[PDB]
Every structure is written in C-alpha cells, then in structure tokens.
Amino acid sequence: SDEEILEKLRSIVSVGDPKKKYTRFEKIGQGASGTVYTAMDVATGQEVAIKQMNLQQQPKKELIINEILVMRENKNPNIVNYLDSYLVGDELWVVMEYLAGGSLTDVVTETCMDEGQIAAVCRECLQALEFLHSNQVIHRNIKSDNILLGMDGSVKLTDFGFCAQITPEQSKRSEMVGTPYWMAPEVVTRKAYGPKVDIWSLGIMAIEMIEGEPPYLNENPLRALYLIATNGTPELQNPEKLSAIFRDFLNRCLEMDVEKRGSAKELLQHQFLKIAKPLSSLTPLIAAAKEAT
C-alpha cells in the first residue's frame, strides 16, 4: 500500500547512467533542498543544471512526482526547462536548463531597478502565469527566489513543488501552502482560492523590486502571516516615488477582491508594461548582483 507511491516515481524517471550522458560536473549550489551541479550534455555539448536531492530526507513523493509531471506537460519559454530525471542511489537527479544570471533575489536585494526594468520582469512572469493559468495550473510559490535570469537577461519561472492542478469541477483550492510573505490573503485565511493568488504573489514580488524585500520581512513568518490577514493590501513605504501607472498596476495585483484583482491575461495588456525596457537592460543588474557576493 505505502509507500508504493514510489512505483509511479520509478516509472517516471529516465533509465540509464547519468554519468554517461553528462560530464564536467561542478558544484554551483548547496541549499537544504538539495545541491545543484553544472554539467555538459555529452550529446549536444550543451550545459545543464542538475539538482540532486537526498530522497526520503525531504520528502514527499506525492509532491515531487507532481513537480516532475507538471513541468513535463507545461513547457514554455518563460518556464525553466525540465530535461531529464534519474534516480541513482536514493538520490533524485533532476536535470534542468542552466541559467547563469542567477536569481531575481540577487538583483532585488543588491541593486535598484527602474520602472522600465521592473516592467520587463513583470511582463515575462505574467507571460508564464497566463500559460500556466490557461493550462489550469496554479504555481502557489511565486517569489523572486523562483525567478531565474539568463546571461542575456532572460526571465524564467521555476520551482513547481507547490503547484496544484484545477478542474471545472474543482475550480478552487484550500491548502495553506506557499511562502508566508508572498501568500495571498485568501490563502492565509483558509478560503477557497483560484489562480489569482499567483497574481497577488507577483504584486509582492514587484514590491521586492521596489523596496528590496516583501512586506513584514523583519517579522517572523507567523507574525507576518497575521499581518497579512488583518491589513489586507500592503502599504508601500514611499508610494509617491512611483509613477501613477506603476501604482495602478500594483493596486490591481494586490486587490483584496479576488473578482476585482487582475488576471494574467488582463494584466498583460496593462499600460505599465508599455514602458518595458528590453531584457538586455537587465544584464547590468545581473553584473551588479554578481559583484558584492
């Protein structure tokens, strides 16, 4: 019975020796959620990022299976590409594309962004969001840490461990999942929510690009969880620094009324995304974040 859920996971993964298909292994990161290596596809000569997790020691097969499956059926230019999976010696190896420009968290916490650079990032993310939302997938963990950057300034979404599928029959969801500071109020208050929670988290992510961090970050997770549920729409520290069209975009991402809050399809047409700079204008941000590290 359990955990015979592994049979699905062992049926998912590709077979064969990952050692044979990839060489030039170099460690690039090592968090609590695994360790990332760079490597070269012996075939195409292409560079890949391989995440290695301890298995059991995390876990949870139900949701890590969900992560693989969801990525496979949801390929998009604005989503970090999933390549392969291999289970070797109680380790789950997930081969992903390599983005060398680091994360949006490096940028937002070490640099200042102009409205043109923020609009370019918001656009790419909404493009990924509209695609997932049309395929009835809710990310539920949108934050700057899950935005990866290409050396050319490419903006791509990652981390599908927390996503959830939806149907016309079950159009909502009720689990208190995600990361506290980015969580929509309707999620914090255990109400039935929809895809628009990702829109809220995008808005908080925009606040990151503005102020360097999401609201209440000095407070502890539970304290922040309380602050969100009571205050509703978060206040900017210096709202007047923003153009009126940026403030409008923000207010529509952070609208308490789910019905009034924008959808990804809607927000892609907003006048704030007009003044978007090309993605090349992100490379000095990237360069700046690298320095001071």
Ligand X SMILES: Cc1nc(Nc2n[nH]c3c2CN(C(=O)N[C@H](CN(C)C)c2ccccc2)C3(C)C)c2sccc2n1
Which residues would be at the binding site for ligand X (CB under 6 A)?
28-29, 31, 33-36, 49, 51, 80, 96, 98-100, 102, 145-146, 148, 158-159
Q: Which is nearer to ligand X, 31 or 168 (CB)?
A: 31
CA dist., res. 32 & res. 285, Å (int): 27
Instruction: Write down the least CB distance from residue 167 to ligand X, Å.
Output: 27
Instruction: Write down the least CB distance from residue 82 to ligand X, Å.
Output: 9
Instruction: Write down the least CB distance from residue 45 to ligand X, Å.
Output: 17
Instruction: Write down the least CB distance from residue 121 to ligand X, Å.
Output: 16
Residue pair 192/172 in contact by the 8 Å Cβ criterion: yes
Q: Which residue is nearest to ligand X (CB)?
A: 29
Residue pair 123/156 in contact by the 8 Å Cβ criterion: no
Instruction: Write down the least CB distance from residue 262 to ligand X, Å.
Output: 25
What is the chain's Cα-based Rg?
A: 19
Q: Which is nearer to ligand X, 208 or 255 (CB)?
A: 208
Query: Token pair for residue 193?
Result: 């929510």
Q: Which is nearer to ligand X, 28 or 275 (CB)?
A: 28
Query: Token pair for residue 145?
Result: 């840490």
- Cβ-in-10-Å burial (0-12, 13-18, 19+) of 226 comes to middle
Is the bond leading into 3 cis (omega within 30 degrees of zero)? Answer: yes
Instruction: Write down the least CB distance from residue 79 to ligand X, Å.
Output: 10
Instruction: Write down the least CB distance from residue 248 to ligand X, Å.
Output: 30
Instruction: Write down the least CB distance from residue 221 to ligand X, Å.
Output: 17
Q: Which is nearer to ligand X, 18 or 194 (CB)?
A: 18
Q: Which is nearer to ligand X, 80 or 188 (CB)?
A: 80
Is the bond leading into 290 cis (omega within 30 degrees of zero)? Answer: no
Q: Which is nearer to ligand X, 205 or 258 (CB)?
A: 205
Q: Which is nearer to ligand X, 98 or 272 (CB)?
A: 98
Q: Which is nearer to ligand X, 93 or 272 (CB)?
A: 93
